[model samples]
Target: AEAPNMKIIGNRIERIRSEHAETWFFDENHPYRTWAYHGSYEAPLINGVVRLLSKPWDVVTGVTGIAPYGQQRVFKEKVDTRVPDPQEGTRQVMSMVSSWLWKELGKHKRPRVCTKEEFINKVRSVNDPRFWALVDKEREHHLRGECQSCVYNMMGKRESRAIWYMWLGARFLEFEALGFLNEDHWMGRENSGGGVEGLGLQRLGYVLEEMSRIPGGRMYADDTAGWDTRISRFDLENEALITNQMEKGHRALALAIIKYTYQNKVVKVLRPAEKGKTVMDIISRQDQRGSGQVVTYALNTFTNLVVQLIRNMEAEEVLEMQDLWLLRRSEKVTNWLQSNGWDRLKRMAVSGDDCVVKPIDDRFAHALRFLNDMGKVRKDTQEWKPSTGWDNWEEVPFCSHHFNKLHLKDGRSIVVPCRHQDELIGRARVSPGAGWSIRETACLAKSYAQMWQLLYFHRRDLRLMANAICSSVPVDWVPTGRTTWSIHGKGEWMTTEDMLVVWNRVWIEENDHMEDKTPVTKWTDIPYLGKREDLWCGSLIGHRPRTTWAENIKNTVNMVRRIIGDEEKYMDYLS
Candidate 1:
């Protein structure tokens, strides 16, 4: 194919992909973002990474959807296939595979819909009881003024795409275990006579359609661009390894896997950090409540066929389970994110662009099952991998229609039926019928949080008026004398540099002080805040000091006790 006469037009896509390899997914690079950056620098890098190390799908199924944009690829770019593309319009082929195909196993409880048409028919024909449910369902997430009702996949709003990547990554690992992959078909390898050429990738469409009819477990979509074919040492490095095993590709993945799987400790989850401390920097975290969402499913329901099986020399840990139920996320991604040192594994994912959406590849999970044997897992956390959750949406006791509005402690009643994260461009725009999909409720989380902050600040104007009488100099201020919260007057314009500072803050010092055990933070960060005295008839809420006499006396006692406990006269820390 290298010979000029062979005319391999798509060759550029892979080479261009290697160029995209080292960049971070969304951290200051668009070339690296795709399908919410699903977890790759770019689509080719994702396709290429899969080719180099986790070549689970053959060229045919892998090739067409390799690029994010343009007409979906086929075996022959020049000729038209009389048959339609296996990937339905805007719908991912993996979704087609999972429902139309994978769920067909006889041993499984719930079965798949026999046909794609039948499947959609079910979604549309369900007890949704007509458009009423769809509208209300969507209204739960859709903002009031912004096309409050929807009918198709909305870009960032759809959870199905998240589920699609989760399912596909898991299924791909399933294929890897069977050794049914064509290593270089999607992104061809240099010096290797493996992969699908022009006809090879295109032909998979026919085979996939035929396969879809039977609903097999394994199957393999969108790319921003098709091919760039600009090779270099990077390309070779990327494809070479045990296929291009570099950085976390071989080492970190293997280490995390060995450490987590070898130990008999109950596999705990790596929950999402609330504010700062992204998964990467969390050296040794925990599975405590308030850590993140709670999975109610038991281990046996952990259902990625690989979970229950005992170890064997030939065993490859593949992320293969797709649980029938979970309030949020699929199991493939959940296993390791929940297992151990997920931050380390996630960092590896960015570097390797490993399982497109960061589902631990079973090869590595197995290689780590033993790691690199194979892997499966979901994209993870948020919509960059965002800070999202429909989990919060569920926790809110609102009924959507005659929804119960929550009154913040400050007496302001509130409800944000629909909310979204900051990655505003992220939703797939697939449809409006999706409904209250993004639970992080970033939209209202911050809004309500701001309102409460103002209520506190306003209610605590005693701090300010007292400061004015006590001593001071001032031009403008947002928060208090101490926590000056970014200068937005409670809602700053959020400059890029200012935001970067906040982002950096998100991952700062995760491991610090987590194990101090010495009774600290007693006076270091405790709030002197107390409830409003229910506001007198005239409502002089600000006149009253925040800390009551009782609280002040208690704090003085605690400080005296803490000082006595330390006894070293190390007033430095108390300062």
Candidate 2:
């Protein structure tokens, strides 16, 4: 059986629902199934018309119409008011009906027509009936105010211009999909009525038509938009990388751009394109370019992609495979470096002298890698150039093996080598381990060893001190304590100083056997009583002390213990 093309006056209208029981008008071109009913009552006739018109149309086909129900009463009342001649009355009635129909159709009601589940199902099945069912459901839900309100709220909050602009932008893609702009899809009679559904679609169509008129609609409408050109100069140099699967390219380039452009600036240069001169530049130009919405969006999107990529990499066991090699290599290198003494090897290597024992190439390689990781070496250039020239040749010997033989006035010259020599001499003086006599030297050596042993037991305590001072102090603190000439604090590297103060305070409070009746009082009164006075003195006189002075020797031991935990590990130094 053939379906009839029903018409009212001059306009042709299609039935939204068919008379056939099984068949349904559910194609993209005819989403709604129309039905006609002859009823005597004006209300039923209007209701019938509305019931037929309200049938949901296919979104792809864009066919839309308004139901003529619920407005016949209004139409009748208007017709009765303007009655005069028979012909004129009939004309007036038709005009009233048409006006009423237009008004009823154009009312912006909520689209109570679809649900997410129904939409997904319809899309999956390619079933036009199921799809229209979803649309009808959404339209009904919207009209009843049961649909999700996020988009509606956004519409109300934003300006019409802004909303229209976004609509136009999104619409450009629709035109591209359709391949042409047709009047029926944009401003035709089919889109004139049928309530908010018809109007909304019409507006959407108009936006698409306008967007298609623009020159760069296809590119600018995309989510990536200006990001590629601004961030990577990607459109200019690496267009192919981002062209095939535009979404994938967008994700990849966006991630790479943010990684490179953070805290960076670019300079512009001129380049020749096919036309003439063109501007070439790096990502992240220093100059301000109005609101940073585009860049912010790009950065956020890039960050999300990076997080996903990292998760994927981890899930695939890429990092787990590398962990085994890393653990083994690190253990070997750490053991070798600790045994050989990195400082000694570094000195020999820098001196251009062959290692007396013929140092292993692995040692050199490990040392180089360590320095590179620590940013002491330039990784890209692989240059071993020192920050300053080698003019201070005297300091090199102090760090070398020859320092072990250097004799002092005190019989402390034969003392075993300790790694702290450089730090001790730099802080106090010529011979930090050398005492006034061999006996004093031996006492100091025993104290140093005991300090290291104590540190082994209280390793965690030392770590706490390091964490506290390093984390607590600000970068700058001048005239730290109350006393004017106080050695309590006041320096860039005051963490160590602060720790020593606390340690000395604790030691004074805890040691009840101290002979001094007023240890705390004496410490408070004396300028550097509880501090490293010898280091302070050396700094003031511009001359380094030979060894830890009588007052600070105990504290120096304590400091050594706090730094190095194992005494037996440093047993060779006591020889």
Candidate 3:
């Protein structure tokens, strides 16, 4: 089937003059009293409007090289006669202000800031007759849902216009940077910069003049499918001409490939098809040996174009794929594995056969079997004996030397471990009474908060909840003194258990206190404790895993609930 006919319209072909004039109309307000009322300024008013409509057209035509016709001509004429009286100008400005305010008000629904009660109350107060009339008029069209008279419609138009302006401004800068419009260039006259060049400012002014025109002339068709279809009745002839030219170019490319292949005798088995056969049909004829090579070249070009078009259409997807690939190759996982000696394990596995052998078949198999049998024998040999005394549990050695050093400190330095006799004896040998101060305690609390914040910040639900709670509290409530949380070159001494105790206590005391006084009105109002709970529960049950701190908090809270009689007071915080 023949391809559908396409056309280019005045709108599709954006040239420098038309764009400059448009920008002038929107920004300069050159014929200020013409479309707008400058009050008692009749001569300037008439001159401004007439000059704007007339002189700029030739310049626009020259740049675009497209003559004015039909609707475009009508648009130029209408703008010429649109001079308004002083009262009319005032009325238009008022209408624009009112419209702008209405758009702004629409943003308050389900507001991220205000309370639900406040929002509802604010909406209800607009019982004034004028406001109600506007609302009623808006409702009749039901423009709220679709991209018709909605706030989103205005926002989208504003953004598109802004982007266009920005692009034009950037292009203009590029021209200057490349000396394209330098004084030495052809058509570079002294007044040329101010007149036709100044017409850009005039166009911007015109656009600004029509800013009060509600639903500015539809730049696009209403038919959704035809939204991107640039062809129009006005440019049907022009579009057909361009399309024919493009087809000729395509055919030339195909013919070049065929001629080159035939001359080179690249693949000499097959012959070329008769002239007038379609490219696809010619390629399908397997009898022509060189035909496949020609077809491959054509296919390759088509494939390249197709790939380029796909990338353009789904640019965001390409960007996301690139980002995802980078994240997958991030150093986080590599560093984790290296720190855990996984690299050593992998090296061992690759370097020797022993690393690959099963435990049962290895040299240690008999030793392991003997140990297992001994364990079983010991269990069998054990006799039940009820004793009056409790079983003694030996303390596990410190996991690292740093922890041991801290445990051994005394004299208002580190809080000595109270339970272990060895640790207590070590502390006594150094000094007596290593009790921590109020400053020390406050320091510990801040450290704990910082740790929890750092660990859970990326966890959205938790972070949100924490932010809510933190924001609710007064500045005084935040503990002061000893802001330093780090152990100074000792690595992080903050354990999961330590985090649990700190977070739990803070939630119970400080966060709960805020919630009781402030009352939760928004998502942010919930104390950080609530956020922590949500983070933990959401990760474990909702989508992803909670941070290590959150998991520790959950486990500890569960333990606390089992032991405490007043579980309601603690657990009810979440509710």
Considering every candidate listed, which one attains the maximal TM-score?
1
| CA lDDT of each prediction against the hidden true structure | 0.21, 0.22, 0.22
RMSD to the native, candidate 1?
A: 26.9
lDDT computed for candidate 3: 0.22
**Ten-residue region with minimum lDDT total, candidate 3:** 278-287
Total clashing pairs for each candidate: 79, 28, 31
lDDT of 2 by residue, 1-575 (tens): 11221221001011111222233222232111121111111110011111111122111122221112112232122211211121322222222223332232224321121233443443351244664464444334333323211010001111011010112211222122211112112111233211111121102222223223333201011011121122222111221121222244233432322222221122111122234322221111211111122122222222222222222222223223333223323342233334433222222211111011112222222222222221222223434432121122211221122211222122212111112222322211112332243223222223222232212112222222223222222212221211111111112221223433433343333323223433332212222111232222122122223221323433443344344332312211111
Candidate 3 structure quality by residue, lDDT tens digits, 1-575: 11111121112122222333432212232222212211111110011111111221223322123111232232223221221111322222222222322232223221111122342353352335665464344333222211111110000111011000112222222122211112222111111111111111112222222221222221110011111111111111111121122244333322222222221111101111235221100010101112122122222222122112121212212122232213333343224323522221211111000011111111221222211111111112222211111111111111111111011111111111112212211211121124644333323333333333333332343343333222222223333322221111111213323333443343223332223322222322222222343333222224223234344444433443343222233322222
Please list the residue runs of candidate 1 whose C-alpha ends up more than 4 Å from where it truly belongs after superposition: 1-120, 123-369, 375-420, 424-575
Q: Across residues 271-388, which tens digit of lDDT does each residue of candidate 1 receive?
A: 1223532211101101111100011011101111121121111123322221111113334333432343222222110100111111222222222221111112123222122112
